[PDB]
């Protein structure tokens, strides 16, 4: 279901990205960032634009924001376009 | 450096450094000054060594020095010693931060396409570093040159 | 049915069924007595629901039965009513399953590929199902006509 | 021309040689008819010259 | 993978017992040759690009067929330079994973990362298994040329290369 | 994935010899029919939907695979057919241009009869659909072009059998 | 020894492209019949055809003359063209140019 | 050396018979580097520019065939004197990969 | 056109254009003189190609113009011929572009959604384009009629 | 295990109908080629050992599967080949007479590619041996008879792939 | 992504009118230069690496961006340049064939100057590299062809500015 | 070898090895020093043992090398001696293994199927091995010639 079942350290599925997203979450951000690949010079793949602006969901913004810095990216701006704040029920 | 590899390698698993890794930082920091004492030995012999590198890279490869080769001319040979100076300067960085990243984030990653767009034969540069390692053995005693030996042949492995 | 996709919904989410899902499987099975009565009305009224269904279909779309229409002649007109007997049958399945899941994977998924590949005007067969809907809802009370008509218009929606 | 003239006896076919022209050698199989040595085997060919004449 | 140590510890865990002295004697034999296992490895990094080059010429000097057209058997030997480029690349791997496996003191890294599917992969591309194994031991004799006056480094160097040889064989006997 | 030129070059290369008179003799034979194959592949691209509509209506339209219980009953299952028949008429067009059926078994034939047995698709009705589809394809492209396009249809039918 | 096996399917690695070849594959990868632009692609290289083929035989026929005239330039020591060995596979034959 | 002066005549007469010069490009890119130690490279560029000078003896120039095969010779000889491509590397993300 | 999608093909593949792609851009531009003559014939024959196009369309499909048909009445029938003037125009674009790329993203992509949403029988408009094709190919020689008709039948294929 | 007549009778029986004009139309087509298949199967029986000797010498005789380490090195392993190639040339003869490749997958193809992977037999060299064996078989029986016998060889090569 | 023919068809279509004399007048002007553009794109494909090697050595080879501290010091950073300059010489070749610079801003210009500011890439040295690359391109393709290929280089330099 | 089949013998019988089996593994390994000397003699005498082996083979069987013989010409005669180099190699294996088990599953099992399927006279290759035997036993003393000849005649027996 959601990503906070009871998993933490020392648990059977591997220790990973745990987001505070509810059941079928409907909140999503509008993020903007550059993310240079830092791996094209030994792979020699084709090049793709690294400056992107896209709507990521609340269910997986934290994983994406945690990963964009993994590969040296810089986050220029993020906002919560869709969803409420301090909302107990209704994020579903 | 080596601590940076442990912080990074422990960070993609979302955990603190384990028992073995903290050895790898602790043992690295206890051998600290000996890298510091060693790099000052090499910095005082940079004019020592690159003069000896130009000895054998060109008696081995007179193709490059001759008229028509890339290194023909004064100003082409002028930077020729500069590339030795930057490489030797990079190795002092690698000898200090006890790993290969300063030899890899600089110098190694994409070096062939740099030289291939310059006309420098990439095989000749491999012998240049091999020449440079051959030159460092004379101004260095047997104790500490095998400390610096594995940092040289990584460059040769990186260039092939 | 409502039972099978309320399961496969909670199946994918790695969880059991909520009260919202189990108070409706409960609410559906107590509804099961009333569903079989509704499907029992359409079961042995297919003679009138189909034949009067194709009644208004030809009066509203004489092109499809006129010479050049897809259902022209004694042959195609028989198959012209055969499909209405199919879709009237699937509505009896959807009423008993409490969902258009039987109607979904039979007669709806990829229906435009079939009828486009048969030369049949897909809008024409949509007009046929609407004519059957007025005959079907005329056979039942208001509480039932909000269901039996309810499954036809879903078939109307997916058929265009 | 057939030249079927007479006295077509059967026994005693003799010897000599002629090696008549091929045909149909105008077809097109993609593989040759195979041989053997080369690489791995120049040693023994040169060396079966030794006994070839015996 | 598993080194000589972890392979030893799994040996005593399966039986669920602590490490006795026969177990520790096996670990000590690694710790004695462990310092000798490195300059074997350090010599390989200094002699890596060379040792592949002597292996190739020593190979094709006996297998000239590998540099020739395949015959109608669409077989992958070093016919074209595209074939030759990738075919030298395999000698990279056999020297590499046999270099780690010298340091681990155990062939656990060999079979799971080299042997598993090796006959699978070569049977697909129709690659020579015979000459492929012979180049593996041309490297072994070439590496043992350096450490030759004594003979306790020789058994260390032989163990990875000998393991690939016995395992890549279709068993005649 | 080899055409007639690729297959000729492969056999001439696999013996390490140059392109002799016999290898070029077949290549000249392929270039002579190069004009015929494009026009054959031209009209087949135009009448792709019409050919498949003609084959199914002529072979398996009203048989009881079409009726309930038959292998083609539901609309998803019927729609899979014309999707499925499109590949046979399409890949056969590729073999007709390349002049070599290597693309068929590379991308169609392998794991095909083993897949229909899994789904329970009737191989008997499938081949007759392709045979009827081969019959209409000879209508459009002509006789000899139909002989060429027809030469790869039964190749599919043979291996799919 | 390996105690399992995934199987070895027959795989033909790529060797080169041809003009008759890749355009058949490009529309192939997009899941479509080639269009009239690409049908115009496959046709006039076939229309090159015999022009390409005759270039082979005229080049193939005097192959020794093409190779020998290079031998006169950059090989001292008389002829030095004896080491030619045209059949490079050790086959008896099927046919020879 | 005669075997390779052979082969340069060959894939050219496979590139003419094929569509493109691509088969030459794959087998001539890193070729000069591999044989660079047992060969003076300039003793190949002389030999490869003798084949075009010889092969241009065959055709009436400024006809269509003269421009076809000439363009295929300079694809192999000029690209012969050209640095070899760098090896592509596939570094893995986590431990168990190789 | 053939120029723009031969580019975007080789664009996606990270490569330049092959001889197979550049000997056809070459072959297309030398074909450009003959293409403008063909499109010039259809340009000022739209009065006959459209009006005779709707000639056979109503004789073959009197339902669409009869009372109840979609194109019923003087001021629609006008729109009934307007669409044929559209599709006849797009064929002139496809002939000059050497491809149905202009016809693809105009009048073909999502055409079934429009005509289904307008109540128009999409099969009927397909019959209209076929009637225009016989008039168009009757205006040109055999070498041209294999092209001008060639773009109509593609529009026939995508329109059903 | 069905021939052309068995397959025609099965399809005509499986619908419960008599042998109409279309079912007998194919049967007449099979009886026309009945004279060709026997003479094709006649010469193949005579030159069975000669055909297999020609195929192995033309495809995989001197390749390094023949040398040590290759898949065919030991005499038991070499002798298994000509035993193994005999079935392909023999069962293909049965398919050529029966006019239906049902006997091949019934008795040859099933568990075959799954068996060679177990033994580690190279499927690539196997198909080229059968392809070369198909090439010599077209030499003996002629063109059209070679087209018939060749039609079942690649059926083995397709499924064995 | 429009060529000269696509742009002419779009403007003539966007008003719903046929291709009048003015629309075909420009199309005839494009077909006249069709022979020049292919030969221009021919030699540029041949001397792609040579042109980029000439531009960097003539514009920014020895400047202190090349020396420690500048934004092209490290080998990864130097290798990114010739990778980066390859697109400018490549996409400019596409604009020269298509006769319309729509592909440049579609696939190169948008988010480009906004990207170099993020990385801190000097736009000043970039344009002079393209200007020097434009200068050598006029050497190969000639004067008027250099005028055509040069017309898209400064289009990149203008928008990238 | 004697070690492996003395095991698989006692393996099948559900028992260990008797003194009769273990006093011979013992007796064989003390024999191992003398076996390597014998195999060492045949190892670098293959030039004479094979070439003189084919010497007497052609003088005794000129049919096989005459025109029409299987080993006719420069080609087959090279392979004609290649097989003798094979069988001479297997005898070196049998001497070191102390048994014809290496010779059994290599060059003996199914050998008649190969040579019958190659057109080679199997009796002719048997004559070749006998000619090698007289050359081999002429190179060793009487105590050794009772062994080296002993493995050849087993190969002679199984090869007919
Ligand atoms: C590694 C650097 C880093 C940080 C720090 C980070 C923070 C971060 N904190 C979050 C939420 C949150 N953070 C808090 C925290 C707090 N509430 C309080 O009253 C306190 C003041 C505070 C605890 C100290 C809460 C309650 C949420 C949930 C908000 C919501 O559901 O709307 C979220 C939304 C997604 C998720 O949690 O799955 C992110 C991405 N991400 C990163 O990559
Ligand atoms: C920190 C890592 C690093 C390196 C190594 C580097 C190299 C580098 N070498 C260059 C040129 C050159 N390099 C050489 C080099 C040589 N000729 C020989 O015979 C020798 C084997 C070799 C020198 C030891 C020559 C001849 C040129 C000039 C080529 C030309 O412009 O014509 C250039 C162009 C500008 C310049 O000289 O500064 C760079 C950037 N940049 C870097 O950031
Ligand atoms: C259960 C879901 C389902 C449906 C709907 C279905 C339809 C279906 N309709 C068919 C034919 C047909 N359907 C029509 C239908 C029509 N003509 C008109 O004018 C009207 C607009 C329309 C009917 C209201 C005609 C004329 C044919 C015969 C077409 C021909 O013979 O070419 C056929 C081919 C013959 C057959 O096997 O019956 C199928 C399979 N199959 C299914 O499994
Ligand atoms: C880590 C262990 C490991 C190995 C060894 C390995 C091998 C391997 N060798 C390959 C190809 C190949 N290997 C060769 C090798 C040879 N040709 C000969 O004639 C010689 C016998 C031999 C050189 C010794 C050739 C020619 C190909 C290409 C086959 C072709 O495309 O024709 C390929 C397919 C290309 C690719 O790499 O994607 C793989 C995967 N992979 C692995 O993971
Ligand atoms: C390009 C080579 C290639 C082929 C040929 C191919 C076939 C293929 N046919 C399928 C299904 C199918 N194929 C049919 C076909 C038929 N029913 C009949 O009665 C007829 C005899 C026949 C039409 C001629 C049907 C009905 C299904 C759906 C089966 C199901 O839902 O269980 C499926 C299952 C998945 C899907 O359709 O999405 C595949 C993968 N895949 C390939 O990659
Ligand atoms: C069809 C395109 C093509 C070519 C040409 C090719 C050549 C090729 N030449 C080779 C070696 C060689 N090539 C040559 C000689 C020469 N080469 C020349 O182009 C000159 C004419 C001459 C020097 C003047 C020599 C001496 C060797 C042996 C080098 C060594 O021992 O490593 C090798 C390594 C295997 C071998 O020993 O033959 C290849 C793969 N491969 C190809 O796919
Ligand atoms: C360039 C591609 C393209 C097309 C094809 C197109 C069609 C199109 N057809 C329309 C109407 C219409 N189209 C028809 C057509 C027909 N009636 C029949 O009986 C025949 C079967 C058929 C014509 C042959 C009719 C009757 C209307 C008016 C419908 C109404 O008033 O409700 C309309 C709404 C009115 C208008 O703005 O013109 C559009 C936009 N637009 C486009 O951009
Ligand atoms: C097809 C249109 C297009 C362009 C042009 C493009 C550019 C682009 N240039 C980049 C970097 C770069 N570009 C340069 C370029 C230069 N340094 C200098 O001094 C010069 C002025 C200049 C060479 C002319 C350098 C050094 C980097 C690496 C920056 C870094 O590692 O921080 C990157 C970061 C990622 C990577 O290279 O893998 C992108 C995405 N992407 C595109 O999609
Ligand atoms: C280790 C056990 C072993 C043996 C013995 C063996 C034999 C063997 N002998 C062969 C050929 C041959 N063998 C001969 C032999 C002879 N001609 C004569 O006149 C003599 C009687 C006789 C030799 C003394 C000939 C002529 C051929 C070539 C036949 C042909 O080309 O058709 C071949 C096919 C070519 C090859 O791959 O070498 C094999 C595999 N393989 C093995 O693994």
PDB file of N, CA, C and O in Angstrom, chain C residues 108-131:
ATOM      1  N   UNK C 108     -17.158  -4.767 -26.357  1.00  0.00           N
ATOM      2  CA  UNK C 108     -16.747  -3.381 -26.197  1.00  0.00           C
ATOM      3  C   UNK C 108     -15.270  -3.151 -26.447  1.00  0.00           C
ATOM      4  O   UNK C 108     -14.909  -2.152 -27.069  1.00  0.00           O
ATOM      5  N   UNK C 109     -14.404  -4.047 -25.986  1.00  0.00           N
ATOM      6  CA  UNK C 109     -12.975  -3.852 -26.178  1.00  0.00           C
ATOM      7  C   UNK C 109     -12.644  -4.103 -27.641  1.00  0.00           C
ATOM      8  O   UNK C 109     -12.866  -5.199 -28.161  1.00  0.00           O
ATOM      9  N   UNK C 110     -12.114  -3.086 -28.309  1.00  0.00           N
ATOM     10  CA  UNK C 110     -11.784  -3.219 -29.711  1.00  0.00           C
ATOM     11  C   UNK C 110     -12.975  -3.369 -30.620  1.00  0.00           C
ATOM     12  O   UNK C 110     -12.845  -3.941 -31.704  1.00  0.00           O
ATOM     13  N   UNK C 111     -14.142  -2.871 -30.213  1.00  0.00           N
ATOM     14  CA  UNK C 111     -15.324  -3.020 -31.050  1.00  0.00           C
ATOM     15  C   UNK C 111     -15.220  -2.163 -32.300  1.00  0.00           C
ATOM     16  O   UNK C 111     -15.749  -2.531 -33.354  1.00  0.00           O
ATOM     17  N   UNK C 112     -14.551  -1.015 -32.216  1.00  0.00           N
ATOM     18  CA  UNK C 112     -14.437  -0.157 -33.389  1.00  0.00           C
ATOM     19  C   UNK C 112     -13.555  -0.784 -34.455  1.00  0.00           C
ATOM     20  O   UNK C 112     -13.740  -0.514 -35.645  1.00  0.00           O
ATOM     21  N   UNK C 113     -12.603  -1.625 -34.055  1.00  0.00           N
ATOM     22  CA  UNK C 113     -11.770  -2.301 -35.040  1.00  0.00           C
ATOM     23  C   UNK C 113     -12.575  -3.326 -35.825  1.00  0.00           C
ATOM     24  O   UNK C 113     -12.384  -3.476 -37.036  1.00  0.00           O
ATOM     25  N   UNK C 114     -13.471  -4.048 -35.149  1.00  0.00           N
ATOM     26  CA  UNK C 114     -14.291  -5.042 -35.831  1.00  0.00           C
ATOM     27  C   UNK C 114     -15.230  -4.382 -36.825  1.00  0.00           C
ATOM     28  O   UNK C 114     -15.205  -4.687 -38.022  1.00  0.00           O
ATOM     29  N   UNK C 115     -16.054  -3.453 -36.346  1.00  0.00           N
ATOM     30  CA  UNK C 115     -17.080  -2.868 -37.195  1.00  0.00           C
ATOM     31  C   UNK C 115     -16.485  -1.989 -38.286  1.00  0.00           C
ATOM     32  O   UNK C 115     -17.043  -1.914 -39.386  1.00  0.00           O
ATOM     33  N   UNK C 116     -15.359  -1.328 -38.022  1.00  0.00           N
ATOM     34  CA  UNK C 116     -14.671  -0.639 -39.106  1.00  0.00           C
ATOM     35  C   UNK C 116     -14.127  -1.626 -40.124  1.00  0.00           C
ATOM     36  O   UNK C 116     -14.106  -1.334 -41.323  1.00  0.00           O
ATOM     37  N   UNK C 117     -13.689  -2.795 -39.665  1.00  0.00           N
ATOM     38  CA  UNK C 117     -13.145  -3.810 -40.553  1.00  0.00           C
ATOM     39  C   UNK C 117     -14.221  -4.636 -41.228  1.00  0.00           C
ATOM     40  O   UNK C 117     -13.910  -5.385 -42.156  1.00  0.00           O
ATOM     41  N   UNK C 118     -15.464  -4.536 -40.779  1.00  0.00           N
ATOM     42  CA  UNK C 118     -16.580  -5.194 -41.433  1.00  0.00           C
ATOM     43  C   UNK C 118     -17.323  -4.274 -42.386  1.00  0.00           C
ATOM     44  O   UNK C 118     -18.255  -4.724 -43.058  1.00  0.00           O
ATOM     45  N   UNK C 119     -16.939  -3.004 -42.458  1.00  0.00           N
ATOM     46  CA  UNK C 119     -17.668  -2.032 -43.237  1.00  0.00           C
ATOM     47  C   UNK C 119     -18.944  -1.540 -42.600  1.00  0.00           C
ATOM     48  O   UNK C 119     -19.675  -0.769 -43.234  1.00  0.00           O
ATOM     49  N   UNK C 120     -19.236  -1.951 -41.383  1.00  0.00           N
ATOM     50  CA  UNK C 120     -20.473  -1.537 -40.747  1.00  0.00           C
ATOM     51  C   UNK C 120     -20.318  -0.147 -40.142  1.00  0.00           C
ATOM     52  O   UNK C 120     -19.294   0.150 -39.525  1.00  0.00           O
ATOM     53  N   UNK C 121     -21.303   0.714 -40.306  1.00  0.00           N
ATOM     54  CA  UNK C 121     -21.263   2.006 -39.621  1.00  0.00           C
ATOM     55  C   UNK C 121     -21.427   1.818 -38.128  1.00  0.00           C
ATOM     56  O   UNK C 121     -22.488   1.384 -37.672  1.00  0.00           O
ATOM     57  N   UNK C 122     -20.380   2.128 -37.363  1.00  0.00           N
ATOM     58  CA  UNK C 122     -20.423   1.924 -35.919  1.00  0.00           C
ATOM     59  C   UNK C 122     -21.452   2.835 -35.275  1.00  0.00           C
ATOM     60  O   UNK C 122     -22.041   2.488 -34.247  1.00  0.00           O
ATOM     61  N   UNK C 123     -21.684   4.010 -35.858  1.00  0.00           N
ATOM     62  CA  UNK C 123     -22.747   4.872 -35.366  1.00  0.00           C
ATOM     63  C   UNK C 123     -24.113   4.240 -35.575  1.00  0.00           C
ATOM     64  O   UNK C 123     -25.030   4.467 -34.781  1.00  0.00           O
ATOM     65  N   UNK C 124     -24.266   3.447 -36.635  1.00  0.00           N
ATOM     66  CA  UNK C 124     -25.540   2.794 -36.875  1.00  0.00           C
ATOM     67  C   UNK C 124     -25.865   1.745 -35.830  1.00  0.00           C
ATOM     68  O   UNK C 124     -27.007   1.639 -35.382  1.00  0.00           O
ATOM     69  N   UNK C 125     -24.868   0.958 -35.424  1.00  0.00           N
ATOM     70  CA  UNK C 125     -25.123  -0.042 -34.395  1.00  0.00           C
ATOM     71  C   UNK C 125     -25.346   0.624 -33.049  1.00  0.00           C
ATOM     72  O   UNK C 125     -26.032   0.072 -32.183  1.00  0.00           O
ATOM     73  N   UNK C 126     -24.777   1.811 -32.842  1.00  0.00           N
ATOM     74  CA  UNK C 126     -25.076   2.552 -31.625  1.00  0.00           C
ATOM     75  C   UNK C 126     -26.528   3.001 -31.611  1.00  0.00           C
ATOM     76  O   UNK C 126     -27.176   2.994 -30.559  1.00  0.00           O
ATOM     77  N   UNK C 127     -27.059   3.385 -32.771  1.00  0.00           N
ATOM     78  CA  UNK C 127     -28.473   3.724 -32.855  1.00  0.00           C
ATOM     79  C   UNK C 127     -29.354   2.521 -32.576  1.00  0.00           C
ATOM     80  O   UNK C 127     -30.458   2.673 -32.044  1.00  0.00           O
ATOM     81  N   UNK C 128     -28.891   1.322 -32.924  1.00  0.00           N
ATOM     82  CA  UNK C 128     -29.686   0.137 -32.664  1.00  0.00           C
ATOM     83  C   UNK C 128     -29.828  -0.149 -31.184  1.00  0.00           C
ATOM     84  O   UNK C 128     -30.904  -0.528 -30.717  1.00  0.00           O
ATOM     85  N   UNK C 129     -28.750   0.038 -30.426  1.00  0.00           N
ATOM     86  CA  UNK C 129     -28.801  -0.247 -28.998  1.00  0.00           C
ATOM     87  C   UNK C 129     -29.670   0.771 -28.279  1.00  0.00           C
ATOM     88  O   UNK C 129     -30.326   0.451 -27.283  1.00  0.00           O
ATOM     89  N   UNK C 130     -29.692   2.012 -28.765  1.00  0.00           N
ATOM     90  CA  UNK C 130     -30.554   3.013 -28.152  1.00  0.00           C
ATOM     91  C   UNK C 130     -32.019   2.680 -28.373  1.00  0.00           C
ATOM     92  O   UNK C 130     -32.854   2.907 -27.490  1.00  0.00           O
ATOM     93  N   UNK C 131     -32.353   2.138 -29.544  1.00  0.00           N
ATOM     94  CA  UNK C 131     -33.731   1.735 -29.792  1.00  0.00           C
ATOM     95  C   UNK C 131     -34.125   0.563 -28.908  1.00  0.00           C
ATOM     96  O   UNK C 131     -35.277   0.469 -28.471  1.00  0.00           O
TER      97      UNK C 131
END
